[PDB]
Design a binder for this molecule. Structure first.
Ligand SMILES: CCCCCCCC/C=C/CCCCCCCC(=O)O[C@@H](COC(=O)CCCCCCCCCCCCCCC)COP(=O)([O-])OCC[N+](C)(C)C
Ligand SMILES: Nc1ncnc2c1ncn2[C@@H]1O[C@H](COP(=O)(O)OP(=O)(O)O)[C@@H](O)[C@H]1O
Ligand SMILES: Nc1ncnc2c1ncn2[C@@H]1O[C@H](COP(=O)(O)OP(=O)(O)O)[C@@H](O)[C@H]1O
Ligand SMILES: [Mg+2]
Ligand SMILES: [Mg+2]
Lengths: 714, 714
């Protein structure tokens, strides 16, 4: 069988292909784990990541660039081929069989498809990855059934589910009892002209219906409460786990990918609470209805069974094409909305270049594509509805025909036929719902896998080693031994930095843009870990210091500061909750912010709308600096904290942090060389290694890269 | 009556309040016209904007701060009051009546509400705007009916609407004829034991049903085609008008506000093609069904009429609360999504400050609020469904009861009762749909107004003056006369900006961040117009040159560069539709971009994913510079176009610009002073003024702000 693992996101096509190959060869594991192994980033994965993950997964993989002629030759069928769609997006596919000019490929985006050779090589890039099990490829099933894990949420709520079951049973029994009103009307009351009996029986059936309505009300309230509880539990569990995952999880994913998993909570709930309750109620409901129908007449029961069989066959046949059309519509709508967002976000360039006519044409073409996909799905739905209506109406007419024939033959009465028509609802609707549960359960299973593969990921605290409790301070020499680092599986950023930062000293790191300075700042702060080597504080390894203390004694002022929607009192007290106002005022004094914030409306409680969109960039930078010095750190890192600020405020903060109390280490990452000349030591980093060090005068005396940069920049 | 104009967006509370006041006083205008009159930006309007718009509208408006005791006294009741909603939003409300300690206020976000004086004063800021009509307040109704305007898309589609109407009439007639099968069964066939007649009549009714199904198929296909056509037409008209609007429309609105009308298009279409057709079909079909039911039996028809009256009353009663609950749910979901996006985007700061615990608490609280709103709406729906089910089921039971009574009394037969039960569908479903049209029509009207206020806005071309056809190029001295400017209604950016760029000589403009240099760059390109004075080229006013020529002969490289999703060639040729590859290569060389593009996969057709997300900042900026020089301009503006470049590329672009042929004017807006020294003339901008002009030699010698900044920044 050709395994085709669906891709959950837009950037895990290669991971999906590798998972498909592994499952075909007998190894099934989490797709999130493989996506971590392949070094998948926000820009998808590449061939090298696939080969590396296959090699370290047990396979014996290799890469090869081949033309169309090489495909005619013989080799291992299950290979991964890099393809390009629409002179556009680059995907990966799994070739499963090279037949006569026709190639079967599993594409994670679409499914199992057949491409003729010519168009395949038109879209297939020359790259190719060959896989084959090696010496150590122990087969396994390292994954867990995730519907059971989420269904375990029903254990605390067994009292609510039990009441729903009883209410549903009583509702069904009352409805079945009340469906015989039409039988009692024609066979007994109308025929014999009984009036008092008519009134009494009608009043009794009205009371029965009112009881049925009350039971439905109670059951609906209970079901709504159960669904809300399950939704809240699932969303809160997912969010609580996500907030603890390491930093390499957030930089390998987009905001949309993380946020969209919340809808998966409702998708799972719709089958955890809905599908199970529907099954339990409708199985007994349909069994009772079928027994009663067979009691009424066997032939009519068989006719109704044939009707429901035809309905189920039609629905099962139409299942997959409808979901394919829905996926295509979703893709087209995403493309159209992305184009609209891009064209309205860069409207200034379009206006300047006079491209308002071609943008309109492109948008119209995308709208046409969306309409074509919508028409395809609508035609599918119309065909399905027409077939279902034919089946239902012709079955009803045939049931009436056969019932009239049976009444004529004397096998049954007219009231019995009308009672059969009434019980047809209580027999067919449960089975109809049971059949219709199939599309919901598949979507719920997909969402359960998508949301629960993340829950298996180890958090940041679980990956840490054993910590030594005798360390209570981070004051001391900061030693960078031979440190390697690379963001995932890209080219290395840091190669052989080996430096020492003395305690209580103002140290500066300068270099070209995109050279590995912010990377060093994040490495010191324990975001990510060095691939090779160690980082030491006061002679102690960075891995042996508790994560809570390491994040509480190191303050960061990033290049792209972030301010959350809230009061200034809350934006300046993100971590701690018990802090005096005097400390906040003192912290804002050194950042040249208190005078600015005082001019704002009210006091240190003004709400910052839209992540501080009313704020300006320099003001937010001052706020971030104030927060950093408010944290009272042992090490303070300023990653270009004065890039936007004017000369006066920059000088003010420079003299403020220059004369700080206590032996608090200060590191300043600078792009403009003239900004800092008074730093105790200056480190020159060019392409991932330090080349020069010392005081500013010392590097000037020693002719080298620093002097050339100073001369060409000043 | 108390007028309460609801707000269409999140930033038009003050505009909605002013519109409500005007409508209360007899003047009705478009909300978009008022919104642009108030100077509403993306952060909303304030008291000054409302006062200015009211004075422009003929009112005699004033602004004053009021205390709690001030409300005790008497003043003009219809006044706008600034309030603070949930310590987050600076909203505006319209006070209408001051009753005994209870204040009636129209809030555009909620409706007409009543606040206790204590609670209001707790949520009411001291500010107050008093409005009163002046000498010139000629009333009117300066707006059009958007529903009638959007109903004009049915004119070319009058043939399709006619086919649908005829098919629906035939379908309804066939169904009404086929509903008598059960009447023929019991009164004629079963009673008299007719078998061959039974088979013949059953076959005939089956054929009738098949014809009905075919008619439904054809009508559904036509309806789908009609809906798709109308939706596409509305969407394309809206986008075509939006692309032609001035820039003050695009920077006063968010991206979401502009994009959200593409769903309003579908909302309008749902009533353009749904409401009219439903009315036309259902009125006639309900009339026929009611006449037939009255023919069958008068008392049962009256019972069914009472049933449908009760259903309509219940639906009308439950209309408003359901939509209020839905709006509340939408607001809460939007808040939760915004919080989730904020938390995910700023995960680095949360981790660095160890604030995962409190972010989880805030998200849980927002989830709880969402669940509360969801439960309120669910309970409203449960109550509505229970009442409707009671009415329907008890009506059916009562109809069966009264029909049996009439059959016993001899006023009708059993088959007549069964036929009445059958025709109950064709009588009750039409009126049910007509009653259910109310939520669709109101939402469609709101969406139509929202989408059509924009279409009344004047485009960029319509606001221009007469164009001089004798102007063919913009090569000449560029004179800024006494020029004032201010974005929207904020603090003015330029005061007396007066300067002269010589023809063909490279000139630089320097200053602080947020000083008003990019504003000058936009002003020279007809984005926005100066409040006072004129801008001239070669003695010709900027307002007398065709907008097509101005945008064609001026090239702009903004501080932020936008790259559109597409091949490099398409981006480099955004405006012109015809150009040879040699010029593209030549332009790329002088911007130091050709070498980078060569190393990319493919040569120049490399599609740039996600608006060029693959490229770096320097690569994007070099590509934009290449595009601008490819434009072949007469004036080239570089608004900080060398910031992200390294020194080598900076020098290459610098001496490429200095090596430009022809007398092409070059303007360079520079932040770093050292970046430009060789410019022919330098203008210094500090506060909306040029205080010092000249080359580097004289400006350094002359003591002033430029000398101080050069000394303190180098
Ligand atoms: C909650 C949602 C409910 C929605 C339904 C809304 C309606 C609800 C209420 C409906 C009741 C009122 C509607 C009319 C009912 C009688 C009509 C009829 O048969 O015609 C006859 C009624 O004249 C009579 O003789 C009266 C005797 C009543 C017969 C039994 C009716 C059973 C309905 C159960 C009662 C309702 C229980 C209420 C429970 C809901 C007239 O023709 P006749 O045969 O010649 O009459 C002989 C005497 N005569 C010559 C003097 C006239
Ligand atoms: N989040 C990320 N994911 C993948 N690669 C990154 C990320 N951030 C930076 N890089 C890469 O690492 C290199 C180092 O950049 P960085 O150290 O951030 O520059 P700077 O030191 O100027 O802040 C860059 O060339 C960039 O391509
Ligand atoms: N899109 C806008 N809407 C409203 N006000 C703006 C907008 N852009 C700029 N401003 C205001 O006008 C001034 C113009 O500054 P600007 O020329 O952008 O500075 P710079 O030359 O450093 O880019 C700014 O101080 C800002 O407050
Ligand atoms: Mg950086
Ligand atoms: Mg600028």
């Amino acid at each position: 069988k050709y395994v085709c693992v669906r891709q959950y996101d837009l950037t895990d096509c290669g991971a999906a292909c590798l998972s498909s190959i592994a499952q075909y060869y007998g190894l099934k594991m989490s797709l999130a784990k493989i996506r971590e192994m392949t070094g998948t980033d926000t820009q998808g994965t590449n061939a090298y990541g696939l080969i590396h993950a296959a090699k370290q997964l047990g396979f014996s993989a290799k890469g090869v660039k081949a033309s169309k002629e090489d495909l005619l030759k013989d080799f291992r069928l299950p290979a991964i081929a890099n393809v390009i769609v629409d002179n556009r997006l680059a995907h990966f596919v799994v070739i499963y069989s090279i037949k006569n000019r026709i190639i079967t490929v599993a594409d994670p985006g679409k499914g199992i498809v057949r491409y003729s050779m010519d168009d395949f090589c038109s879209i297939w890039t020359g790259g190719l990855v060959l896989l084959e099990p090696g010496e150590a490829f122990q087969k396994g099933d390292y994954t867990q059934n995730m519907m059971v894990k989420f269904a375990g949420f029903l254990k605390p709520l067994k009292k609510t589910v039990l009441c729903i079951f009883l209410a549903s049973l009583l509702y069904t029994a009352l409805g079945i009892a009340g469906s015989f009103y039409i039988k009692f009307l024609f066979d007994d009351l109308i025929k014999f002209e009984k009036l008092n009996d008519l009134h009494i029986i009608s009043a009794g059936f009205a009371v029965i219906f009112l009881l049925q309505i009350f039971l439905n009300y109670y059951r609906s309230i209970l079901v709504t409460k159960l669904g809300m509880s399950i939704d809240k539990s699932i969303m809160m569990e997912y969010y609580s786990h996500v907030l603890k995952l390491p930093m390499n999880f957030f930089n390998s994913r987009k905001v949309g990918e993380i946020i969209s998993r919340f809808m998966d909570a409702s998708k799972i709930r719709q089958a955890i609470s809905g599908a199970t309750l529907t099954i339990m109620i409708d199985t007994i409901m349909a069994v009772i209805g079928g027994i009663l129908l067979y009691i009424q007449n066997s032939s009519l029961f068989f006719i109704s069974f044939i009707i429901i069989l035809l309905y189920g066959i039609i629905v099962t046949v139409f299942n997959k094409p409808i979901q394919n059309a829905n996926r295509q519509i979703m893709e087209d709508n995403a493309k159209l909305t992305s184009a609209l967002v891009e064209s309205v976000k860069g409207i200034e360039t379009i206006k300047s270049f006079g491209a308002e006519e071609q943008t309109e044409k492109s948008t119209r073409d995308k709208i046409e594509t969306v309409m074509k996909s919508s028409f395809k799905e609508g035609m599918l739905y119309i065909n399905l509805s027409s077939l279902t209506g034919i089946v239902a109406g012709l079955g009803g007419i045939v049931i009436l025909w056969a019932g009239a024939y049976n009444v004529i033959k004397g096998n049954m009465s007219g009231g019995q036929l009308l009672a059969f028509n009434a019980l047809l609802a209580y027999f067919l609707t449960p089975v109809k719902n049971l059949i219709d549960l199939q599309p919901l359960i598949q979507t719920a299973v997909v969402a359960s896998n998508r949301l629960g593969e993340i829950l298996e990921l180890a958090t940041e605290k679980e990956l840490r080693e054993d910590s030594d409790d005798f360390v209570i301070s981070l004051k001391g020499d900061i030693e960078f031994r031979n440190v390697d680092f690379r963001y995932g599986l890209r080219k290395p950023v840091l190669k052989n930095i080996n430096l020492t930062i003395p305690k209580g000293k103002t140290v500066a790191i300068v270099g070209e843009s995109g050279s590995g300075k912010t990377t060093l700042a994040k490495l010191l702060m324990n975001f990510y870990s060095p691939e090779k080597g160690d980082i030491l504080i006061n002679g102690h390894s960075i891995k042996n210091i508790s994560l809570e203390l390491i994040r509480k004694k190191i303050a960061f002022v990033s290049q792209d500061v972030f301010i959350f929607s809230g009061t200034v009192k809350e934006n300046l007290c993100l971590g701690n909750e018990n802090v005096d106002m005097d400390e906040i005022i003192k912290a804002a004094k050194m950042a040249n912010a208190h005078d600015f914030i005082e001019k704002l409306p009210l006091k240190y409680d003004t709400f910052l709308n839209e992540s501080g969109a009313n704020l300006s960039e320099g003001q937010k930078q001052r706020l971030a600096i104030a927060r950093a010095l408010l944290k009272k750190p042992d090490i303070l890192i300023l990653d270009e904290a004065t890039s936007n600020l004017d000369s006066i405020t920059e000088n003010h903060i420079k003299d403020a942090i220059y004369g700080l109390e206590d032996d608090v280490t200060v590191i300043i990452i600078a792009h403009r060389l003239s900004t800092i000349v008074n730093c105790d030591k200056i480190y020159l980093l060019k392409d991932g290694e330090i080349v020069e060090s010392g005081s500013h005068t010392e590097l000037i005396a020693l002719k080298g890269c620093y002097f050339k940069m100073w001369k060409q920049t000043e």
